[PDB]
Amino acid sequence: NPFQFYLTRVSGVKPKYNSGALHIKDILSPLFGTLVSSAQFNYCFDVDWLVKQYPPEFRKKPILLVHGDKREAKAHLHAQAKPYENISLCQAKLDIAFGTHHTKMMLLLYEEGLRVVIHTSNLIHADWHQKTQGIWLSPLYPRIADGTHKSGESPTHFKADLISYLMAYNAPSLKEWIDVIHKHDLSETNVYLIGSTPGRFQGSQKDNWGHFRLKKLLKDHASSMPNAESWPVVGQFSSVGSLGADESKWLCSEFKESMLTLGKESSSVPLYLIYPSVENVRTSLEGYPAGGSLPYSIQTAEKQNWLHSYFHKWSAETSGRSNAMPHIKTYMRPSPDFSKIAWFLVTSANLSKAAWGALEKNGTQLMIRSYELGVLFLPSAFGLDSFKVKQKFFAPMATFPVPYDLPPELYGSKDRPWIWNIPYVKAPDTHGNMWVP
Numbered sequence: 001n002p003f004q005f006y007l008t009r010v011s012g013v014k015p016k017y018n019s020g021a022l023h024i025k026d027i028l029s030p031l032f033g034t035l036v037s038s039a040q041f042n043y044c045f046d047v048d049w050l051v052k053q054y055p056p057e058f059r060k061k062p063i064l065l066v067h068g069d070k071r072e073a074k075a076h077l078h079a080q081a082k083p084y085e086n087i088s089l090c091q092a093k094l095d096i097a098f099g100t101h102h103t104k105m106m107l108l109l110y111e112e113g114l115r116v117v118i119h120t121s122n123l124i125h126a127d128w129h130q131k132t133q134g135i136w137l138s139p140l141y142p143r144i145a146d147g148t149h150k151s152g153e154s155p156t157h158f159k160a161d162l163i164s165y166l167m168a169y170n171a172p173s174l175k176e177w178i179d180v181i182h183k184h185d186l187s188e189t190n191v192y193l194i195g196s197t198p199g200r201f202q203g204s205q206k207d208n209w210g211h212f213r214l215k216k217l218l219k220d221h222a223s224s225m226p227n228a229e230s231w232p233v234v235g236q237f238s239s240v241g242s243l244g245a246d247e248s249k250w251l252c253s254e255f256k257e258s259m260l261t262l263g264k265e266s267s268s269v270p271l272y273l274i275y276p277s278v279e280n281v282r283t284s285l286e287g288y289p290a291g292g293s294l295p296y297s298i299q300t301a302e303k304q305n306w307l308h309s310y311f312h313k314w315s316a317e318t319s320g321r322s323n324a325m326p327h328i329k330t331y332m333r334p335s336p337d338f339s340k341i342a343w344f345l346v347t348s349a350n351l352s353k354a355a356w357g358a359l360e361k362n363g364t365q366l367m368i369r370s371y372e373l374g375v376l377f378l379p380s381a382f383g384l385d386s387f388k389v390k391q392k393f394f395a396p397m398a399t400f401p402v403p404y405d406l407p408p409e410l411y412g413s414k415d416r417p418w419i420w421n422i423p424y425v426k427a428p429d430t431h432g433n434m435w436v437p
C-alpha cells in the first residue's frame with residue numbers, strides 16, 4: 001500500500017483485526033530504525049509509561065517532550081520527567097486563551113535516517129489500549145550527503161511545510177529539529193501537511209493554517225467533478241466545541257465552505273458528523289470510562305441542540321472496531337454512493353473553532369487558538385482522480401482504507417450524543433457499572 005495509514009492495536013479483538021495495526025512499541029522498535037533521539041509532541045503524557053514503550057536499549061537516548069502545560073500542570077509534568085536525565089521539555093507558547101497544544105507527532109532520528117509519525121493518541125496507556133486511533137508513518141527519510149546541495153523537497157511541499165509548522169513555535173529545542181529536517185531528504189512524501197498554530201492570520205498567511213489551509217490545498221490540488229453538490233462531506237471526531245447558536249454561525253458557513261472546495265472555480269451538500277452516542281459508549285470495550293476521552297460538556301451541548309441532528313453513530317465493522325471508541329479524527333469527501341472518495345484527512349483536530357480557526361474582523365483574519373496537525377491524502381498526489389474505498393480495512397493496493405463503516409448511520413430517536421458530565425444510570429456498561437460524575 002502507498003498510503004501508510006494505520007490504526008493502533010486494540011486489546012480484545014481477534015488477531016485478524018490487529019494484523020497490520022501498530023502499537024507504540026512497534027513504532028519505536030529497532031526494526032523501524034536505530035534510534036538516536038526523538039521528539040514527542042502531544043497533549044497528555046504519562047512519562048513512566050512512555051519510557052517503557054521504548055526498547056530497553058534506546059531508553060536513555062534523548063527525548064524532547066513538546067507540550068502546552070502551564071502553572072501547576074507544567075510543574076506536574078516536570079516532576080514526571082525529573083527521574084529521567086535524558087528527557088528535556090519544550091513548553092509551546094499558548095498566547096490565546098482556551099488554546100491547547102493538541103498536535104500528536106513523533107520525530108524519530110535514527111542512524112539510518114529520519115521518520116515522522118503524525119497520529120491521534122495521547123501518550124497514556126488507555127489511548128493505545130482499546131480505542132480506535134489513526135497513525136500516518138512517513139517513509140524512512142535518508143540523510144543528504146554533506147556538501148550535496150539539493151532541496152530534499154516533495155511534490156507536496158511537505159518538507160518546507162513541516163519546517164514552517166515548527167518555526168511557528170519559536171522554540172530553541174525545535175530549531176534543533178528544524179536543522180535535522182533540513183539535512184534529510186523528504187522527497188518521497190506523498191501527503192500534504194495541514195497544521196493549526198495559534199494566532200491571527202491575514203493576507204497571505206491566512207492560507208497557511210486551519211480550515212483555510214485545507215481550502216487552499218483543495219482549490220489547488222483537487223478537481224471539481226459533475227454533480228459535486230451530491231458528494232457529501234464527512235467529519236468524524238471525539239470532541240465538539242461551542243459552534244454557535246445555529247448552523248449559519250460557523251459550521252455551515254465557513255467550515256463547510258472550506259470542506260466543500262474542489263478546484264479553482266467559484267449549498268445542499270450533505271454533511272455527516274460521526275460522534276459516539278451514549279449507547280456506543282455504554283456497550284464499548286471500555287464501557288462508560290471511554291467517555292472520559294470524549295469531553296463534550298453539557299454546558300456546550302445544551303446551547304447547540306441544532307447540531308445533534310447532524311450526528312451519526314460510530315460503526316466500524318470494516319475494521320472490527322465498532323466497540324473501540326474513536327479517538328481518531330478524520331474528514332473526507334465521498335461520492336454519493338460512498339464507493340469513492342475525493343480526499344481523506346487524518347488529524348488531531350476535533351470539531352472546534354479553536355482547532356480549525358474562525359474568521360474575525362469582517363472576514364479578513366483567521367483566528368486559531370490551538371496547535372493541531374494532520375496529513376491530507378489527495379488522489380492527484382498518487383496519480384489518481386479519486387480513491388476507491390477499501391471494502392475490508394485489513395483485507396488493488398490503491399484503494400483507500402477508510403477505518404469505519406459507510407454510509408454512516410443516523411442516530412435513532414432515542415439516541416443522544418455522549419456528554420461526559422451528566423450521569424447515565426439507566427443501564428450498566430460492559431464492566432457492570434453506571435456513570436456518575
Ligand SMILES: O=C(O)c1ncc(O)nc1C(=O)O
Pocket residue numbers: 043100122238239292293294295327350
Ligand atoms: O483525549 C482527550 O481526553 C482530549 N481531551 C480534550 C481535548 O481537547 N482533546 C482530547 C483529545 O486528545 O482528543
